[PDB]
């Protein structure tokens, strides 16, 4: 996966986002960034990449009562154990729109 | 923050989507759903609410060399440490244009 280095250049950062110019297939160039805030984060001081999708890590996903999302999800050791998380904790009814905050 | 519950009916989760009927501050009803993969990740079998932009608790971002996004990073003990991630794990040049992968 990943590897864009080798085929851009003049890449930056400034704050969480990463510009850089890159080569496209039919020769000639693009300049684009992308904000990282959405998929890295701040593990204890350390950067680390943002787990995978929960879904795939996690089965039979159920909303318990009015709020809560259950589901059974694997531990590092491979075995799947019961979790549930309150959504009411960022999920809000913004004038008739669910919105994360 | 959060508390949709409170002013949302016929909640139902399929998968990682949240959908439920929201009052408007008009009155009236509306029906939506939000995507959870991107804001709540499994740790170790237990999920999480994923953290927080690594912007709000990193400072001093920056290129090293071609690939690494470096930065001082807080501690839960809240001392900033030094930590670095090559960027080349899951940026990609998609033809011209970075992509997550």
Redesign the interface.
């Given at each position: 996966?990943?590897?864009?280095?080798?085929?851009?250049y003049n890449?930056?950062?400034?704050?969480?986002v990463?510009t850089?110019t890159?080569?496209?297939?039919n020769g000639?160039?693009?300049t684009?960034?992308?904000d990282?805030?959405?998929?890295?984060?701040?593990?204890?001081?350390?950067?680390?990449?943002?787990?995978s999708?929960?879904?795939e890590?996690?089965r039979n996903?159920?909303?318990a009562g009015?709020?809560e999302?259950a589901?059974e999800?694997?531990?590092?050791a491979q075995?799947?154990?019961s979790?549930?998380?309150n959504?009411?904790?960022?999920?809000?009814?913004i004038?008739?729109?669910?919105?994360?905050?």
């Open positions: 996966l990943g590897k864009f280095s080798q085929t851009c890449s930056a950062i400034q704050g969480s990463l850089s890159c080569e496209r297939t000639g160039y693009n684009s960034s992308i990282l805030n959405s998929v890295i984060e701040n593990v204890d001081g350390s950067l680390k990449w943002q787990g999708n929960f879904i890590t996690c996903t159920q909303l009015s709020s999302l589901a999800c694997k531990t590092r075995q799947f154990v979790t549930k998380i959504l009411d904790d960022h999920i809000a009814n004038d008739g729109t669910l919105k994360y905050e």
